[PDB]
Design a protein around this ligand. Structure first.
Ligand SMILES: N#C[C@@H](N)c1cccc(Cl)c1
Ligand SMILES: N#C[C@H](N)c1cccc(Cl)c1
Lengths: 300, 237
């Protein structure tokens, strides 16, 4: 089990770690988060009490380094940093652990939620979507735009999701216009899976990451990407059976975890009604259809 | 965006544009079968592609053989329309290609946009105008060429005859849409108005009769009277 220590908490802030959230008061003696499960990516995120503008946070994997958070009073945020001195980092963490100044990642033993939401998410793929090569962790915030949003504006601060556009030459083979527009299998299987992502695990990893950035930061471009990647599968007549079964599991856990009161802003009515009730795969997502109908029958 | 009454003079500016109407592409008769079920029989159709400034009409005849063995024909007809308009554009010299294509029915937007991805600078637009181009098959010479076709064919016409020698394209389009609206509302009466006087004929190389300026005023008034008469009959006014 690994630890993300904090030098201090000088400003009042809501801190979230994966799907959990807690409040820290201004100058409270808080020195970080322990017992973080090894084997998954994680996200540590922030919303300031005096300015809920800019949710922001950091994706990291404790297997890739020793990371700590220090508030920067000039840029006005909690920054993730890497400590290269292992013995010093261990000594700092041991002191805070003995003084009981760290909260404990409250993972229930029965609870697979975080694995279910991050099954295909890899830190190496995150670092290609979020480009800042000098750090082993990745910063995301509520306002960052996607490459596709910028085409329709600082490129260094962008989310480089794979561009999906159903009315584009990439999606439509000359001479197969009706075929490719009404059945997206070519675009899904040849262009995206075989060509760009190489396999379904990478596609699902990007889908999962987009949903998490939408949910945890309210990042609008990420919500657009999540829905486009769902729609591309549902609008394809030919999809490997293992992908359909896995998509149903992925979406089920995403809908299960979504805050009920954010459904109005995080779920696109058109896409979900099309996917569940009109698309080629309208009958392939039994678990997702059941949770959607019981939890959000208004949207449908 | 969409083309409406606010930007109506735009139709007659010097930017090449075409209207596309797909209403008459897929045409059928509905009938009972021997077993008492219902079946359709297709008949030849046409794409109506018109330059409203010059009157040039590109009438692509859709022969019934294109539907043979195909499913979901009403959907296919939209995509076939878009395929043929795309092929027409590619066939035209660059300086004759349109800068805008206005579709009369919004269901043509996506099919045409997808077929025209190679032409990102040609705008594909809907219209809020209710245009009576479905009545093109009430023009005898157009209906005749469509029904006689034994294979796909493109036929070129000037739907304004020689009117642009005497009137503007705004006035020519207004005359055309009035004539077509009248033929759509009461075809028999409209044709009676146009032919009642045997001394006025249709030239071999024309679609409409050779009316003088004063006779066109009379004809236009009679067409407006027909439309209003039919509106009163319809709504009991
Ligand atoms: N359960 C719960 C939350 N209130 C919570 C409290 C303290 C630490 C963390 Cl991570 C989460
Ligand atoms: N000295 C020092 C650094 N500020 C530091 C390194 C590692 C962990 C923490 Cl909380 C602080």
């Amino acid at each position: 089990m690994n630890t993300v220590p904090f030098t201090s908490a000088p400003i009042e802030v809501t801190i979230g770690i994966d799907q959990y959230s807690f409040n820290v008061k201004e100058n409270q003696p808080f020195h970080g988060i322990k017992d973080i499960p090894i084997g998954h990516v994680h996200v540590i995120h922030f919303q300031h009490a005096d300015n809920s503008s800019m949710r922001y946070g950091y994706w990291f994997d404790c297997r890739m380094g020793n990371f700590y958070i220090q508030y920067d009073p000039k840029d006005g945020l909690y920054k993730m940093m890497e400590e290269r001195d292992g013995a010093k980092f261990e000594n700092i963490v041991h002191n805070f652990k003995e003084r009981q100044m760290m909260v404990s990642y409250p993972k229930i033993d029965e609870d697979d939620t975080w694995y279910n939401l991050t099954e295909f998410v890899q830190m190496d793929k995150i670092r290609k979507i979020v480009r800042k090569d000098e750090n082993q962790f990745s910063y995301v915030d509520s306002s960052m735009t996607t490459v596709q949003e910028n085409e329709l504006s600082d490129p260094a601060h962008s989310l480089n999701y794979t561009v999906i556009n159903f009315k584009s030459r990439e999606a439509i083979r000359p001479g197969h216009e009706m075929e490719d527009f009404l059945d997206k299998s070519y675009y899904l299987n040849t262009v995206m899976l075989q060509g760009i992502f190489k396999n379904s695990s990478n596609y699902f990893g990007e889908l999962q990451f987009a949903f998490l950035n939408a949910m945890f930061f309210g990042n609008y471009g990420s919500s657009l990407q999540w829905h486009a990647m769902i729609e591309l599968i549902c609008s394809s007549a030919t999809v490997p059976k293992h992908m359909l079964d896995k998509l149903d599991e992925i979406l089920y856990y995403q809908i299960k975890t979504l805050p009920e009161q954010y459904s109005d802003i995080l779920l696109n009515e058109r896409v979900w009604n099309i996917c569940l009730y009109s698309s080629f795969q309208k009958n392939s997502l039994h678990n997702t259809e059941k949770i959607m109908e019981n939890k959000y029958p208004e949207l449908l | 965006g969409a083309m409406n009454s606010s930007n109506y003079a735009e139709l007659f500016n010097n930017d090449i544009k075409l209207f596309v109407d797909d209403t008459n592409v897929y045409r059928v008769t509905v009938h009972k079968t021997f077993e008492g079920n219902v079946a359709t029989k297709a008949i030849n159709g046409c794409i109506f592609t018109l330059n409203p400034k010059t009157g040039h009409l590109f009438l692509k005849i859709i022969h019934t053989s294109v539907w043979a063995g195909q499913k979901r024909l009403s959907q296919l007809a939209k995509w076939k329309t878009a395929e043929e308009v795309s092929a027409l554009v590619r066939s035209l010299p660059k300086e004759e290609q349109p800068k805008q294509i206005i579709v009369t029915r919004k269901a043509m937007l996506d099919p045409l946009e997808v077929h025209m991805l190679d032409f990102p600078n040609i705008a594909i637009r809907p219209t809020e105008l209710r245009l009576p181009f479905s009545a093109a098959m009430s023009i005898d010479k157009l209906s005749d060429v469509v029904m006689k076709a034994t294979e796909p064919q493109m036929v070129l016409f000037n739907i304004y005859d020689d009117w642009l020698d005497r009137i503007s394209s705004y006035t020519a389009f207004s005359r055309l849409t009035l004539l077509l609206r009248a033929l759509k509302t009461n075809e028999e009466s409209a044709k009676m108005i146009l032919l009642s006087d045997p001394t006025i004929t249709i030239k071999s190389y024309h679609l409409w009769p050779s009316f003088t300026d004063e006779q066109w005023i009379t004809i236009e008034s009679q067409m407006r009277d027909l439309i209003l008469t039919e509106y009163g009959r319809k709504y009991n006014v």
